[PDB]
Design a protein around this ligand. Structure first.
Ligand code: FAD
Ligand code: FAD
Ligand code: SHG
Ligand code: SHG
Ligand code: SHG
Lengths: 577, 577, 52, 104
């Protein structure tokens, strides 16, 4: 470990990996630190769902997700236990216990918010949905020139999509996917369009999908190496980055202070360029701990000297959720084209279809699958093949239905009674609302309480804004109830409901982007450079300043790409001596 | 991947690794196949609880455990869901769905039995408790000579303890450990002995314990390499081993049939020596799939030609559990040596003691931690330091109390109401019973249903034997109730209970050891060699033929070491070429 | 059911359970105010909550 | 079979039933308010010894029914409240409200 690099990156998630891919590739000497450790096998920072065992037992993956999500702010617990033994030691008060945050108002929280600390960040467990934002959801990169704006976002998104390997074809031959996609297409004919969710993923076989991750963007191997003998890159896991050191003039960062969690050693790392990609919460923490914004409970009678908008205007999406059990009508439609001679299990039972006939409602590939399934598994009462892939359907946000939608299956922990229902019948519904940025909605850091790494403890002051955000979120709930009913009734145990605030993990706006610090109430410019500072950049959904419903990571990655172009045009790589 | 090795080992768990360590170390050319994949970080097969994140958030580790335990046999679900919408597709029967096993009698199951498929096996997540068995629990290695049988066990256990890095001192200065330890010592003085649970672990610092695993036994790195230039070892993950091929005389194994899960191709591997260490369930499955024993529902009219004891006499321990909240008296005792003056938060608050005073009930190291906690955290109402490690107490199995005990804390998922109780108060109680081997208790494999790897579906036919087993299980429950009340009353939500059968994962006897196949109703001899076969060996808790209550892995490793002694005397390593 | 139907709790302390999955449009409390016959005199930690 | 064991509780001056001077109940009467904890010392030790006694004795008949494991019930669920207007020979000496004929 040197202590002088061209570029240092804090965080090895997909956004840090975007900076790495761009800057390592352009010849800079790059160090990346991550407070977490390598834990996706030999492919560093790769998707943990890409093991044969998880793709045969997908519902177990929920435990992997839960195991690495650590709650950001947990209020003091006031649940009464009054059935202790009289001999057991007992509290007279609900005192600060069990890592709870006494700063946290339990009624103005994002109780669902959590962070992950592993190499690869949240991309070792994420669902891989990467839609583009339309204009109404998207920050402007060019003022007063809609077409120029559009072109710039097209070029960045196309590049981001290549890095993630985003595609809309990985589920094209799923019977369940096509069953739901065709029905919803028909029902909303002339009204809404439906398609496959854009997914960062490559199919490898009929039973295996390689989901993308940080590793997809950048493999995280130390360079130089055999395949990259001219590149320079070092990854340092289990290193807590704690502060960037400002010069007295607040025009430049002078070092990054770290704490190696294994040796216990604390160093200053020097670089030309400092990039913070630790996530929407921990970027803000690192900044506040370095003297940006304001530490402690917001006090608007003492406004901060640097980045007064830091940690304000935070946005988190409303999320509604249910599951359905496919209608009888749709299930019967699956076998619409079959002629069924006789009795299942009995001697002459035949299921047959005429290939390429024109009364056929289904393509030959479908009918053939359905045929072999009903013939080979005569004891099974459903026409859907056992190994048929999940549905992955969306109708994308539009002015007339301004929410993102996913009609699909991701890993789920079904109750015993729910496991009574055959999984081929189940569809998840998740609709995601956009939230108006409001100055009163804040993430702030305690000047007294600290987290597990002895950093200032994150505290939320959040409610969904009145007005359009709240009206739309409720409109969105109704829309899910109306559309889901076209496919089947609600699965008992998974009835329509709003999820705990922040459970969705799409937090944005914590260190938001804009053209002008003061006029646009922002912290970085469109190159993702911190105002006033020559050499400090932030990446991640924390940059997104708009109200958006679609999943934000592709948009953050596009911004990181743009940011790297500024870096390449402004900093010269060291000579590789 | 070569076609020919000196030794092939199926499974990379701690037992497979024992064979690797011994045989690789002796110069054999070894290959090891594991159906699961590398996912423990850079240390292959290492304990997943060794990350800084899990040592700061230990309760989250329960998710890691649950994420890799897949249920062995799940009976057909007969739960009634009668609140579906009329439009949803509804079953007329409880048909075979969701991977359930229709062979399984739901009232004769080990429903809690589960298996792991990852490199390192269950040792990536285990609790690391490695007690020796006393004579009462332990199979004979030497007949008609108890002193020599004793000496042989002592030699083998001592070596197995060195491989696991077993110790009894990693918690010696925890306040909570000593508080429970000393109290129980006093309460049972002259009746039972208490000590630390022997743990396979090394303490690296006050807040970090490096738990041992397969990796500790053998690092699983391909050889030759720089540190072992003369050794030969290859590990092949994601390879399902499917059959060992018998010669027609049933006297030798001729090869191992594998299914490469990534390419999807099937191959044969040849070796001089075939060692099966895939765990107590999958060793038996592999053997049955290879023509040993009997496929299908067992039928005495038609006893198997080979190993008629395979899959019979299986044992699983009864397990009772509760948690307690520390008594007021014990908590108050923690600060008994203190002089407390003034009131908290005020300038005159004073907590002091006299180091070395004869009247002190506690040692100086304890008092100083207590003083510092109370002075530095005057708002906290407890005298136990925040970072005080877990208790790890046991009274080992004896004839007057024939169960193993653990009075301790391992990762746990506390309900919201339980989280109301400060964790420093909570102690886990787990008592483990021994189970008499009975011919009627069986693990068998379906001739019709297959598992997720297309192998015969395991099915249990099990009940705790009447007589001694059942009596001692209920007496064991009573003892937990009596002993635990000495420390504190029950935690609501974790009241005394038997755990689902097999949740304990201490399954034994599925391929059991003995001196004589017929007389001792067994499958392998004391060298772990399958009767009749020159070159086939079985390692794991499946070998253990006795009723035992202590945790079995250390005993299984000891037998593996003895097996390797036989191999080294009877086979010659190929020349290094 | 008969027993339960006629046992009226003597003193129920103010309820502090958090419901944070209400829809954004629903009216929502900024404090745990005295609601639903609860007794603000009652310390929930020194009660006979089962008295009826 | 159900098992219910009932412990005795030492009368202590600090354990009180009192009535609010502001809050009223459904009949517009002063709202009852408890200030109660099981006394330390004998009451508490005997409660936990009673729990253990139930565990030991019940095992002679059979094991616990899942969902009805050994537990303390919520304070006052038992409805055996006494001492709120207690009897003694001397109002002052016996700290009481009624005499042995129950007259105030
Ligand atoms: C289960 C789940 C499903 C999701 N599904 C989707 C989806 O379908 N689509 C979508 O767009 N998004 C999804 N997301 C969100 C997505 O994963 C995140 O948007 C994306 O990972 C953010 O990238 P990032 O690189 O900015 O931050 P992260 O992935 O959070 O990485 C930040 C890194 O910084 C590290 N770090 C934190 N503190 C320090 C410190 N002090 N010092 C050094 N390092 C530190 C952390 O260890 C972490 O590795 C999902 C998330 C979850 C977990
Ligand atoms: C949460 C938990 C806590 C535990 N705590 C303790 C404890 O404190 N003390 C104790 O003694 N024991 C404990 N155990 C039990 C202990 O882990 C096991 O006894 C031990 O790991 C057995 O070692 P093994 O090598 O025989 O088998 P395993 O560890 O089971 O390894 C078998 C390997 O074979 C592989 N395999 C399976 N099928 C195939 C296939 N067909 N082809 C190729 N490979 C295959 C599997 O992937 C696995 O890696 C615990 C277990 C769990 C999960
Ligand atoms: O649980 C919340 C998550 O669920 C998925 O369906 C999404 F694709 C994500 O964007 C999201 O973070
Ligand atoms: O959950 C059951 C397990 O719990 C632990 O406390 C033990 F040490 C184990 O040996 C066992 O497998
Ligand atoms: O639930 C408490 C009650 O339960 C019964 O078993 C008793 F007989 C009563 O004295 C008591 O009021």
């Amino acid at each position: 470990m040197d202590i002088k690099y061209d570029v240092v990156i804090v965080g090895s998630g997909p956004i840090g990996c975007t900076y790495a891919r761009e800057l390592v590739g352009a010849g800079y000497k790059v160090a990346m630190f991550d407070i977490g450790e390598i834990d996706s096998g030999l492919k560093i920072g790769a998707h943990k769902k890409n093991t044969v065992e998880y793709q045969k037992n997908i519902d177990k993956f929920v435990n992997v997700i839960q195991g690495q999500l650590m709650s950001v702010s947990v209020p003091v617990n006031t649940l009464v236990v009054d059935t202790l033994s009289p001999t057991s030691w007992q509290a007279s008060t609900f005192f600060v216990r069990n890592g709870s945050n006494p700063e946290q108002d339990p009624l103005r929280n994002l109780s669902g918010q959590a962070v992950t600390r592993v190499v690869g960040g949240m991309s070792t467990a994420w669902t891989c949905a990467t839609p583009r934002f339309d204009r109404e959801q998207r920050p402007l990169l060019v003022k007063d020139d809609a077409d120029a704006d559009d072109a710039e976002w097209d070029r960045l998104y196309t590049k981001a999509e290549s890095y993630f390997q985003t595609g809309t074809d990985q589920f094209k031959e799923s019977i369940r996917h096509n069953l739901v996609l065709n029905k919803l297409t028909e029902e909303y004919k002339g009204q809404r369009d439906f398609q496959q969710i854009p997914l960062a993923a490559t199919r490898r076989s009929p039973t295996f999908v390689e989901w993308s991750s940080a590793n997809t963007v950048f493999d995280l191997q130390n360079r130089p190496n055999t395949d990259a003998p001219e590149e320079r890159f070092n990854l340092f896991p289990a290193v807590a980055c704690e502060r960037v050191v400002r010069n007295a003039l607040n025009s430049e960062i002078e070092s990054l202070h770290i704490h190696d969690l294994i040796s216990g050693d604390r160093f200053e790392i020097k670089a030309d360029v400092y990039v913070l990609t630790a996530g929407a919460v921990h970027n803000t923490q690192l900044l506040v701990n370095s003297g940006f914004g304001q530490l402690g409970r917001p006090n608007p009678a003492n406004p901060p000297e640097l980045l007064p908008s830091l940690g304000s205007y935070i946005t988190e999406q409303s999320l509604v959720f249910c599951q359905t059990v496919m209608s009888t009508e749709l299930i019967d439609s699956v076998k619409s084209d079959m002629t069924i001679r006789g009795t299942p299990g009995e001697l002459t039972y035949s299921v047959t279809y005429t290939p390429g006939a024109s009364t056929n409602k289904h393509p030959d590939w479908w009918n053939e699958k359905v045929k072999n399934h009903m013939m080979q598994h005569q004891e099974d009462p459903l026409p859907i093949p056992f190994e048929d892939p999940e549905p992955q359907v969306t109708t994308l946000f539009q002015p007339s239905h301004p929410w993102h939608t996913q009609i699909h299956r991701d890993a789920f922990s079904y109750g015993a009674v729910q496991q009574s229902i055959d999984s081929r019948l189940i569809v998840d519904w998740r609709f995601f609302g956009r939230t108006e940025p409001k100055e009163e909605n804040k993430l702030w850091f305690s000047d007294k309480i600290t987290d597990a790494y002895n950093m200032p403890q994150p505290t939320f002051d959040f409610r969904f804004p009145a007005g359009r955000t709240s009206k739309e979120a409720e409109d969105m709930m109704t829309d899910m109830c109306v559309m889901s009913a076209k496919i089947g009734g609600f699965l008992p145990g998974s009835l329509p409901q709003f999820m705990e605030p922040g459970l969705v993990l799409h937090l944005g706006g914590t260190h938001r982007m804009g053209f002008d610090e003061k006029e646009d109430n922002c912290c970085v410019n469109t190159d993702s450079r911190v105002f006033g500072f020559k050499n400090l950049f932030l990446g991640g959904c924390g940059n997104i300043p708009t109200a958006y419903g679609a999943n934000p990571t592709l948009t953050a990655m596009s911004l990181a790409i743009k940011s790297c172009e500024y870096i390449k045009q402004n900093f010269t790589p060291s000579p590789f001596t």
